[PDB]
C-alpha cells in the first residue's frame, strides 16, 4: 500500500534483534503492545498516537552466551493474562507474565536452540516449538507436559527453522535446513486423543509418566520447491508460502492444480507452483516475513534495510506491486517484520538493533 516511517527507536545494547511480535490478544482498542528480543533481552513497548513508542518493561537473564531469538504471545485460559514465550540458543523455553513481571514456567526439552515458537490459534496452550535438534515438539503449557514430538526417522535430516499452524489449527507445516518441507496433523484421532489425555493428567495421582505421543511419519515431503535452505513458511489459507536464499517467495500447493488438501496422502510426489512473489538482494537465511490477521498483506525485509510489501487480493495476483519502503538510516539487515491485528502498523527490527515503526495513511 503506502506506509510512512513515523518513528524509529534504537536499543541500548547494540546487538541484533531477531524477534518481534505483537500481542493479537489485546482488548478492543486498548493500545498495541509489541515485544522485541535480542542478545539476552526481552523488551516490551507501548506505542502512542503519533509514535511516542513506550518502553514498558525489559527483562534479562543471567548467561551472556544465551541469545533469545524468538518470542510469541498467548494468554491464560482461566485467568486472562497475556504471556510471552521466548527462547533461543541455550535451548530453553520460558514464559513471562508481564503482569506479575516474572518468568513463571520453563521447559527444558530440546537439544539445541529453538528457532521458533507458535501457538495453536484455537487453543492457546499448545505451544509448538521447533529446534535445531532436527525435531519439532509440541508442548502444553498449563499442565507442563510434552504432548508430542513431530520428529523421528523421517522427520528431518537437518535443523529446522520454521513452522506454522493453519487457521483452523487442525494441520501444520515444518520447514528446514534440509531443503525440505513437510506436513503433520493434529486432526488425527490418535493425536486429538493425545492432546485430550494431556489435559487429563496429574503426576501426583499416577505412578507413570505422560506418554509423549511420538510421530515419526509426516503427511507429505518435497525437496523440489526449493534448492537452498528454507526460512519461513505460511499457510495462506490452504496454500503454502515459503521463501529461501534465492530472491523470491514461492506460493504452491501439494499435488496437481485441482486436487484437495485433506485427500493428499504421503505417497503423493507432485508439486504445484501457482504463484511467485519476487524481490532482490537477499542471499542469507533466517530472514523471516509475515502477514496480518486477515492475510491481506505480506511484509518481507531484506539485508539492505529495504522493505517489500505485497497486497494479495488480486493485485497481479502474483506478478505486480513490488514496492520497497525506505530510509538510509538503518541500511542494516532486517530480520523480522510484523503487523498488528489490523495491517495499520508495521515494524522491521534490524541487525543494528533499530526498531522501524511504519504506519499507513488512514
Amino acid at each position: 500500500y503506502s506506509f510512512k516511517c513515523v518513528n524509529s527507536l534504537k536499543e541500548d545494547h547494540n546487538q541484533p534483534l531477531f524477534g518481534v511480535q505483537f500481542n493479537w490478544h489485546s482488548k478492543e482498542g486498548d493500545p498495541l503492545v509489541f515485544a522485541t528480543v535480542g542478545s539476552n533481552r526481552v523488551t516490551l513497548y507501548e506505542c502512542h498516537s503519533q509514535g511516542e513508542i513506550r518502553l514498558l518493561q525489559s527483562y534479562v537473564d543471567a548467561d551472556a552466551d544465551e541469545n533469545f531469538y524468538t518470542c510469541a504471545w498467548t494468554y491464560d485460559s482461566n485467568t486472562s493474562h497475556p504471556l510471552l514465550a521466548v527462547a533461543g540458543s541455550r535451548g530453553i523455553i520460558r514464559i513471562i507474565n508481564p503482569i506479575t513481571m516474572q518468568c513463571i514456567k520453563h521447559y527444558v526439552g530440546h537439544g539445541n536452540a529453538i528457532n521458533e515458537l507458535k501457538f495453536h490459534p484455537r487453543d492457546p496452550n499448545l505451544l509448538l516449538s521447533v529446534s535445531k535438534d532436527h525435531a519439532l515438539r509440541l508442548w502444553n503449557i498449563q499442565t507442563d507436559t510434552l504432548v508430542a514430538i513431530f520428529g523421528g526417522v523421517e522427520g528431518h535430516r537437518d535443523e529446522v527453522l520454521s513452522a506454522d499452524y493453519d487457521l483452523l489449527g487442525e494441520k501444520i507445516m515444518s520447514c528446514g535446513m534440509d531443503h525440505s518441507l513437510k506436513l503433520w496433523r493434529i486432526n488425527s484421532k490418535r493425536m486429538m486423543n493425545a492432546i485430550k489425555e494431556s489435559y487429563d493428567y496429574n503426576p501426583n495421582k499416577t505412578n507413570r509418566p505422560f506418554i509423549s505421543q511420538k510421530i515419526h511419519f509426516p503427511d507429505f515431503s518435497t525437496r523440489d520447491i526449493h534448492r537452498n535452505y528454507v526460512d519461513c513458511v505460511r499457510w495462506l489459507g490452504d496454500l503454502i508460502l515459503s521463501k529461501s536464499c534465492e530472491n523470491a517467495i514461492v506460493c504452491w500447493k501439494p499435488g496437481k492444480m485441482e486436487d484437495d488438501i485433506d485427500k493428499i496422502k504421503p505417497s503423493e510426489s507432485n508439486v504445484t507452483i501457482l504463484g511467485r512473489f519476487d524481490y532482490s538482494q537477499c542471499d542469507i537465511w533466517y530472514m523471516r516475513f509475515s502477514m496480518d490477521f486477515w492475510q491481506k498483506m505480506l511484509a518481507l525485509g531484506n539485508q539492505v534495510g529495504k522493505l517489500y510489501v505485497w497486497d494479495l487480493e488480486v493485485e497481479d495476483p502474483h506478478k505486480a506491486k513490488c514496492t520497497t519502503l525506505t530510509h538510509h538510516k538503518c541500511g542494516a539487515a532486517i530480520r523480522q517484520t510484523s503487523f498488528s491485528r489490523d495491517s495499520s502498523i508495521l515494524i522491521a527490527v534490524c541487525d543494528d538493533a533499530s526498531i522501524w515503526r511504519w504506519d499507513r495513511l488512514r
Binding site: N228, Y229, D283, I284, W285, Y286, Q303, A333, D351
Partner: peptide, 7 residues
C-alpha cells in the same frame, strides 16, 4: 557456505 550474518 550460506552465511547467516551479512558481512
Amino acid at each position: 557456505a550460506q552465511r547467516k550474518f551479512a558481512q
